[PDB]
């Protein structure tokens, strides 16, 4: 992961070919966890305590 | 069908419990909440009576387990009923009473004692902790 946009790419020297790893892959990321995220959790806790149950 | 509360009060109209009216009245006016219905007083009397029946019954279980005489009487109940049935008229006594004397001075000298060290464990089941030591040094 290297998001620095400056000359030398946040490295001691500006070669930029000598200061970069050989074989890389994509960094871990996550999508928008809006659907799976609940603003209120205590309402879910009272929901699993107090259900209708007839 | 499980009885509704109105049926219980309609039966308490006819059958009053053990704890009489004035004991319930003293505990009422000791805890506030003056009520004028006799059936609520009889229902609270029956509730307290049932709760202490359960506590004293659990004390009876804890006092019958913790004595070797009671579990040995329950083990050898019909085994000694055999000896009592073979205890016929006087011809037939010489082959018995090899074990009768020791449990005779055990079972006839044992009366069930409601004890502090028994009730403390019967209500430590119910949430209390009645810790009375056995000596004071």
């Amino acid at each position: 992961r290297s998001n620095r946009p400056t000359i030398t790419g946040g490295s001691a020297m500006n070669a930029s070919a000598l200061n970069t790893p050989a074989t890389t892959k994509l960094p871990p990321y996550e999508m928008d966890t809006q659907r799976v995220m609940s603003k209120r959790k205590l309402r879910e806790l009272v929901k699993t305590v107090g259900i209708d149950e007839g | 069908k499980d009885k509704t509360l109105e049926e219980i009060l309609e039966m308490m109209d006819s059958t009053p419990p053990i704890i009489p009216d004035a004991v319930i009245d003293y505990y009422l006016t000791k805890n506030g909440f003056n009520v004028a219905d006799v059936r609520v007083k009889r229902l609270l009397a029956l509730a307290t009576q049932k709760f202490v029946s359960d506590i004293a019954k659990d004390a009876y279980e804890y006092s019958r387990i913790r004595s070797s005489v009671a579990v040995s009487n329950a083990n050898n109940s019909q085994a000694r009923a055999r000896q009592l049935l073979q205890g016929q008229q006087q011809p037939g006594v010489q082959q018995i009473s090899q074990q009768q004397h020791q449990q005779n001075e055990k079972t006839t000298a044992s009366k069930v004692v409601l004890t502090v060290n028994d009730l403390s464990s019967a209500v430590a089941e119910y949430g209390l902790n009645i810790g009375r030591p056995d000596f004071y040094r």
């Binding site: - | 387990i65 009487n73 083990n75 949430g127 209390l128």
Partner: protein
Amino acid sequence: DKHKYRVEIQQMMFVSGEINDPPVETTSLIEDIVRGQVIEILLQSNKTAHLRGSRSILPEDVIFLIRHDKAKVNRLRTYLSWKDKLPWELQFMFNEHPLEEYVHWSDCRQASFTFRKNKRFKDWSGISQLTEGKPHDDVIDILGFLTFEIVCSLTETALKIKQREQVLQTQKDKNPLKPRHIEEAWRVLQTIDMRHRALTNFKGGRLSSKPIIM
């Protein structure tokens, strides 16, 4: 270690509800729950039987711990009727007494916890670790029947709360049992009764108690 009784736990799970090949984690959690419950049963029964003055744990001494459930001890009494008088009873106060897959459904019920021999059970549960004497007259048969009942009731309530969590999930936005289902089934089965709490409710102090055995 652990994971000793996995296939037998699966066999006892099959009798309660559907099986759907339960995972390693559910069987491991049920094994650790039953291994804890057996140690608590043996500790309470040994504490009760030592004060009588006999280190040999009697058969009735473990039925003492489940004396409240009358239907379950009647079930134990019918379970002790194919091997081809309680001390706290009403008669025993007084001194003297007078004179196609249905077959596959059944064979899973015949599969038990400690039916074969008490060889893996004795060093798994640790019978010799906490018992001061030699209890093995019928304590192992009752300690098999109790674990069968524990696993049956535990997976029954875990199935019912999995179904209720399923209907709660399909109502919120509109197959296998997990460790969270077993843990909340444990929370359902380990709530103290109201009559066993009544005498500490208005006074404020942290209730110390004992683990309720099934």
